[PDB]
Write a protein that binds this ligand. Structure first.
Ligand SMILES: [Cl-]
Ligand SMILES: [Cl-]
Ligand SMILES: [Zn+2]
Ligand SMILES: [Zn+2]
Lengths: 349, 369
């Protein structure tokens, strides 16, 4: 099916971007789709909650005293704000590691205002500034916890990566051979699986949170999932930072969902049971996964907000906090409005 | 499967370890001097905002404005009228020099400042807290041309940028005439520099650039020319001789035009349009035309990195230049996919297929898409 977000200058088509989306229930049954909802998709940072699970399920990790903020950073593509780097350093301290132990590299900040601040001060970002720094410290913590040694914690043949590989396939309900692996910008293995399975991970996150809240019997696995949901909802500034879609989405909704960006314009949302989900004809939590085929971030945020509006997730009041993402500014160097965005797609049911 | 390939399948693709990351739809037209279509990718008649790729057509409207010759604009100045420049100091200085030649001030410009198209210029600006103003606009030189036009005909500099102004009437007609289109087949929006900007089928953008390179061939041959073909040959020559004014250091357009040493001109449009005018050569004759050639490209989704990759791939598929001319552009053709720890994690490939002249079954439709 033929689903585009379209940008226009004076009603004249500028760019068009192909949209894929899956809305799934708690068991990962497909409720709603755009484009191809099973598109083989690199989840990139959208997978970090599942990598966080592998760290949290590593024997001895509880001993380090990681708090909800720390777990939030494990789940983060953060903007590398001073407060992100400070929490990375404090997490290194809790496991008696140093920055030299990190196998991720510096890069320009995911926030242009942070990056401009760095440029002004001639600052060259190092390992500790990685958007992925919290995940790498988690991996160091897991490595040391089982006495596997911290050297090579990032390599596919290290037991930490064997744990991550198994945990991703389990959460997706996939055989090992159905998950493909490349290398991320931060130099860890990174999975690809059908986009609907990314929605399933986040439906299980939200369903865990629901199960915890309703005093139900839970595996250690569901209890860990609910703790990850809780940490992301509680400290959304650690997951992203000031002005970032994921932070403003999670603050607007105040514990009702979690949202996570993946690089090259993936998005995942886990939504707790609500009048909205019941309305959509499911009894449980749901998951939403989205890919912009061509990788455009600005179009991703526009489409995710349009999707929430079409699914009736939130009130119009809540969703209005995301107005500048939904209909991004199309204004020239002289303050004249030159065009906008349109959403000529229909959700299939 | 390889025998049922279609324009809808004309993609440039990025991979991580062989896994598809992003894919981008490509549209391209290759046309002769009269604008006959020789080769295509995707939909070569896609209605497309030319944006800055139309700047040579706006430069022609300025140069054919009676009295403009009086101001003493040189080749460097005309090159800046055709520019999307990086706002380097030499670009700002040249703009101020052009403002003096017409006795106008920075205050008469109706374009606004913006971040430099060059990361290196931007870094320098960030460092010194510099806020770009009108005179730094990538489009500054086009705007001074328009002012120059406005003064020469006695129209008033006030509103020179508005559709009702006779300078914008001249642009409107010149663009339709160069495209060989009725007015009603060219649509108009507003550009980032706050001028009218046209949209026409992608193949007519290639036709404009074919006419530029054709005029250059007629001039070099010492053929008698219309005022129009003489002016087009002057624009070609200005762009080819002063490619640093058209863009700047490190910019695809400058490096492409230096590499080819007068054999073609090339211009970026915002949101990933490109236009090339190729002078008659062995290459163009090999491609089955006895004159100059035009190429126009659009990435459907607007990705600029994929545009430079695709344009370089397409020059190589058309046989334009030596491998050794083209290899100044290797870093644009096959962009680096190196992670934060120096490890290559993937790259770009070009699963698209030139059509127009291998011969496929007459029953395989090639639907513009
Ligand atoms: Cl003509
Ligand atoms: Cl990378
Ligand atoms: Zn990472
Ligand atoms: Zn302009």
């Amino acid at each position: 099916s033929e689903d585009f977000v379209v940008t226009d200058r004076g009603g004249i088509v500028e760019n068009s971007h192909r949209v894929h989306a899956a809305v799934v229930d708690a068991k990962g049954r497909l409720l709603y789709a755009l484009g191809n909802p099973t598109r083989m998709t690199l989840a990139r940072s959208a997978a970090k909650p599942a990598q966080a699970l592998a760290i949290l399920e590593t024997e001895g990790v509880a001993g380090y005293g990681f708090d909800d903020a720390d777990i939030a950073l494990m789940c983060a593509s953060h903007s590398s704000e001073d407060r992100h780097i400070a929490r990375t350093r404090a997490m290194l301290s809790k496991i008696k590691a140093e920055e030299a132990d990190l196998r991720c590299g510096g890069h320009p900040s995911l926030s242009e205002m942070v990056n401009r601040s760095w440029i002004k001060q001639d600052f060259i970002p190092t390992a500790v500034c990685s958007n992925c720094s919290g995940k790498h410290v988690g991996m160091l913590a897991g490595a040391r916890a089982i006495g596997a040694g911290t050297d090579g914690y990032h390599l596919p043949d290290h037991p930490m990566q064997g744990r991550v590989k198994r945990t991703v396939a389990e959460l997706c309900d996939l055989d090992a051979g159905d998950v493909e692996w490349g290398t991320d910008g931060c130099n860890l293995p990174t999975p690809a699986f059908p986009l609907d399975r990314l929605g399933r991970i986040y439906a299980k996150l939200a369903s865990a949170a629901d199960g915890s809240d309703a005093g139900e019997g839970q595996s250690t696995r569901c209890a860990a999932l609910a703790h990850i949901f809780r940490a992301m909802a509680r400290h959304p500034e650690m997951v992203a930072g000031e002005g970032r879609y994921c932070t403003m989405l999670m603050r607007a909704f105040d514990g009702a969902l979690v949202g996570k960006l993946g690089a090259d314009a993936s998005y995942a949302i886990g939504v707790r049971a609500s009048d909205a989900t019941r309305q959509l004809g499911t009894d449980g939590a749901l998951g939403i996964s989205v890919k912009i085929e061509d990788g455009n971030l600005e179009m991703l945020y526009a489409v995710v907000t349009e999707l929430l509006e079409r699914l009736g997730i939130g009130s119009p009041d809540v969703r209005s906090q995301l107005a500048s993402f939904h209909h991004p500014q199309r204004v020239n160097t002289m303050g004249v409005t030159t065009g906008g965005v349109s959403f000529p797609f229909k959700l299939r049911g």
